[PDB]
Write an enzyme that holds these catalytic residues in place. Structure first.
Site, PDB file in Angstrom:
ATOM      1  CG  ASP A 235      33.781  33.640  24.378  1.00 21.57           C
ATOM      2  OD1 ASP A 235      33.839  32.542  24.974  1.00 21.57           O
ATOM      3  OD2 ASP A 235      32.721  34.283  24.210  1.00 21.57           O
TER       4      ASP A 235
ATOM      5  CD  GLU B 297      31.714  27.048  22.510  1.00 17.73           C
ATOM      6  OE1 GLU B 297      30.775  27.005  21.689  1.00 17.73           O
ATOM      7  OE2 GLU B 297      31.560  27.420  23.695  1.00 17.73           O
TER       8      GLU B 297
HETATM    9 CA   LIG Z   1      38.411  32.594  19.927  1.00 17.05          CA
END
Ligand SMILES: [Ca+2]
Ligand SMILES: [Ca+2]
Length: 803
Positions: free
Chosen positions: A12, A261
């Site tokens: 991420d 997300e």
């Molecule tokens: Ca991020």
């Protein structure tokens, strides 16, 4: 071969540039830096603490957020969940000594799929240590006193910051709709409070977007001096119908439990759009993780895609149609004859991106993690350059960045044969693969697709296939498979669909057919005991036609027929006739197929004499365990069996067999079972070098069916798709020959597989019947445990099953 990479695993990743060094900050408190976006160096220590690189004493520094989630609670039990941070220099942040300017890190903590918060910390220097300031948005709170499993954290809303916000008058009060009737968190409409993204708007104001599945993505204005949100204070709707909430902010994407997300928004002043990146699907190899793209003229939305569809979902629906799908699973699959080696360069589940948009030069970069074909859950960071297309959408380069830039491209450098990947809208574990087309000098496209193309100016690409026009650019890219810089394109249509193209080197059909012949290899054909894979295609649609000199041995498709036990090995020729256009070439392979051989009986625990002995005399007897392989305390009685008497396993006991009962990678196991009851994972035959290196024959496996099972380095699911009955006798057997594993039930093969691990060779394993280290003991009768050297023949198995 010039370019060089140095890879790191940072899940991420959030890019940020400090001076002339690029930094990425990921989940699990990982971070790395580069001078060139190609060669990365990690400088963190994960979740080590104290002495945490980024946080020092992690537990003490971030205790504020940890009182709610992410430290040794529910799903974080035993450890930590510090996820998906964002980092940026806030030049207006007032530090605690009154100075101005800090690096801020906004992070997520999470203890379940819903109970999370976002908090932030600050440091004057980008490598930390970062120092807690506050926890600002909470999710997963409840109307009344409540507790998740493996947690004693009171999830009631009064334990968040919401009382204090109400006290400050920043909120009227609690919002009824945050709860279902039963008092539980309404995550159909409100968010999971993770995956924050901080961005400046046209006017230099500060926003935070965040969210992940649940009710979707929300955004909040933020005070530049302090880092705190400026909460809306009242509920409403945006002009176009989107939820505005007094606390959570303004919904800009997702909804209704659907995926989405890793939000990242960028303001582009050259185009005056706000670009919204979000990742759909699940992050695992199997999850179809894929990056989506929308845009808005306002930071607060509406964000729409190339078809003008909203990022905010109309309901609990498939989110596939929504967002430009800019990257999913793909493979520039190496076919027989292609240069280089391996399967080719492809990605699986690429996603959760950040973006670096250089202010001076307009150069733009998509930064993300990805998994790969045939590497399971292993992940590394990738960087793909982006380029503004003529419709105002950045388009993603097909290959990772390797120092290239937009250039004046001559038409002669474009015309040619291309590999083409169309990313579509759909996503799943499936992997997209190339078609082969040509961009011709007369401005048509031919081959696997037809239509047209032009180059406008230096490099704009326009490609129209079957009435769809994709706009983008031509750009040179590093192809690591061929080890060349090749011409490429990337382009987006008004469906929000991206095609990518890689130019193949010019080769004559003679040359291609020669390359295919050289690269065509069947492995060892002198000791053949199972079907051969015979490829029917080589590169660029070369046709490989197979003929056998004798189908009795081996068919045109590589189906083999092993002679009976006692017969000579048989030989045959397979001829590959390789054609492309009018060129052809021939390659002959001489195939020896081995006869079956009988497995030799090496141990027989029959229980026939009311004891635990091995009738062959090769091994010491069995001994009695308690409810685990390594304890004592139990009993074995002997009842009437399927053949003679049988061991009675009462549910509290097992049999420990000698170490080394199997000590090779060519072996078989056979036994009879009458389960009185069924329990999940519970073993019959169990052999293990240790708790992470074992094989187990399981009557009711994780999928509720009989399986052969191995774990945990690697896992292997020998699935049978057959339920065992209780109170009845069932024969079970399996063979393992150097990778080849087969599994029979009542004489019938119900699983066949390859790559099966060699658990029993490199040290003497422990062995047992009915017990392991973890699960309920087998309850029932077991009979006729027979061990062998070598894989049993099919007919040997039908024999055994035949009583
Ligand atoms: Ca991020
Ligand atoms: Ca017996």
């Amino acid at each position: 071969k010039d370019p060089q990479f140095t890879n790191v695993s940072v899940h991420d990743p959030s890019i940020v540039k400090d001076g002339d060094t690029y930094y990425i900050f990921g989940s699990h408190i990982e971070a790395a830096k580069s001078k060139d976006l190609m060669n990365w160096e990690k400088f963190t220590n994960g979740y080590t603490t104290p002495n945490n690189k980024l946080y020092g004493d992690l537990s003490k520094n971030l205790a504020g957020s940890f009182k709610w989630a992410g430290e040794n609670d529910a799903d974080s039990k035993g450890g930590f969940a510090v996820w998906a941070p964002d980092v940026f220099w806030n030049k207006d942040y007032v530090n605690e000594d009154g100075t101005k300017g800090a690096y801020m890190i906004y992070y997520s903590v999470s203890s379940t799929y819903i109970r999370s918060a976002i908090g932030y910390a600050v440091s004057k220097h980008i490598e930390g240590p970062y120092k807690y300031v506050d926890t600002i948005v909470y999710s997963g709170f409840t109307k009344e006193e409540a507790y998740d499993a493996n947690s004693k954290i009171n999830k009631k809303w009064t334990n968040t910051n919401i009382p204090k916000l109400i006290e400050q008058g920043k909120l009227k009060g609690v919002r009824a709709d945050w709860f279902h009737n039963d008092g539980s968190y309404n995550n159909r409409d409100f968010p999971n409070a993770i995956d924050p993204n901080l961005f400046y708007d046209e006017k230099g104001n500060l926003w935070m977007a965040y969210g992940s599945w649940s009710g979707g993505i929300f955004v909040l204005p933020m005070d530049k001096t302090t880092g705190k949100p400026i909460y809306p204070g009242k509920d409403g709707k945006t002009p176009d119908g989107r939820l505005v909430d007094r606390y959570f902010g303004i919904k800009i994407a997702g909804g209704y439990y659907q995926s989405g997300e890793g939000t990242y928004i960028v303001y582009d002043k050259n185009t005056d759009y706000y670009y919204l990146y979000v990742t759909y699907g699940w992050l695992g190899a199997d999850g179809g993780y894929n990056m989506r793209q929308f845009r808005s003229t306002s930071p607060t939305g509406p964000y729409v895609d190339a078809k003008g569809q909203s990022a905010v979902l109309p309901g609990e629906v498939d989110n596939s149609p929504y967002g430009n799908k800019i990257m999913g699973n793909f493979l520039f699959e190496r076919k027989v004859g292609d240069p280089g080696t391996g399967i080719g360069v492809g990605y699986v589940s690429p996603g959760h991106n950040s973006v670096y948009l250089d202010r001076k030069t307009g150069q733009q970069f998509l930064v993300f993690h990805t998994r790969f074909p045939q590497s399971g859950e292993y992940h590394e960071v990738r960087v793909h350059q982006m380029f503004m297309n003529k419709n105002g959408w950045p388009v993603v380069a097909p290959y990772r960045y390797a120092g290239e830039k937009l250039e004046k491209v001559n038409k002669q450098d474009v015309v040619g044969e291309y590999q083409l990947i169309n990313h579509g809208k759909d996503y799943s574990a499936d992997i997209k693969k190339q078609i082969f087309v040509r961009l011709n000098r007369n401005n048509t496209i031919s081959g696997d697709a037809t239509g047209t193309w032009r180059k406008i100016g230096h490099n704009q690409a326009e490609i129209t296939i079957d009435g769809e026009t994709y706009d983008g650019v031509f750009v040179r890219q590093w192809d690591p498979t061929s080890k060349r810089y090749v011409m490429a394109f990337t382009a987006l249509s008004n469906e929000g669909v991206s095609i990518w193209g890689s130019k193949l080197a010019d080769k004559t059909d003679e040359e291609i057919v020669e390359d295919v012949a050289s690269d065509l290899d069947l492995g060892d054909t002198d000791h053949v005991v199972s079907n051969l894979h015979l490829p029917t295609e080589g590169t660029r649609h070369t046709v490989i036609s197979w003929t056998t000199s004798d189908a009795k041995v081996v068919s045109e498709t590589g189906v083999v027929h092993r002679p009976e036990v006692g017969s000579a090995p048989v030989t045959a020729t397979l001829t590959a006739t390789i054609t492309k256009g009018d060129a052809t070439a021939t390659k002959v392979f001489h195939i020896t197929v081995l006869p079956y051989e009988e497995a030799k009986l090496t141990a027989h625990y029959s229980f026939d004499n009311n004891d635990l002995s091995d009738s062959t005399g090769n091994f010491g007897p069995g001994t009695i365990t308690g409810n685990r392989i390594d304890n004592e305390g139990g009993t074995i009685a002997y009842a009437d069996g399927k053949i003679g008497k049988a061991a009675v396993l009462n549910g509290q006991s097992g049999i420990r067999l000698p170490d080394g009962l199997v000590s090779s990678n060519q072996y078989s196991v056979s036994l009879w079972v009458k389960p009185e009851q069924l329990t999940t994972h519970t073993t019959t035959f169990f052999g293990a070098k240790d708790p992470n290196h074992w094989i187990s024959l399981v009557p009711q496996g994780w999928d509720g069916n009989t399986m052969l099972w191995s774990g945990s380095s690697p896992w292997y699911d020998g699935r049978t798709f057959w339920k065992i009955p209780t109170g009845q006798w069932t024969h079970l057997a399996f063979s393992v020959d150097n990778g080849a594993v087969k599994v029979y039930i009542n004489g019938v093969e119900k699983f066949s597989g390859t790559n099966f691990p060699d658990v029993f060779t490199g040290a003497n394993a422990s062995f047992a019947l009915g017990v392991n280290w973890w699960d309920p003991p087998f309850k029932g009768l077991i009979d006729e445990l027979r061990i062998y050297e070598g894989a049993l023949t099919p007919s040997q198995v039908t024999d055994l099953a035949q009583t």
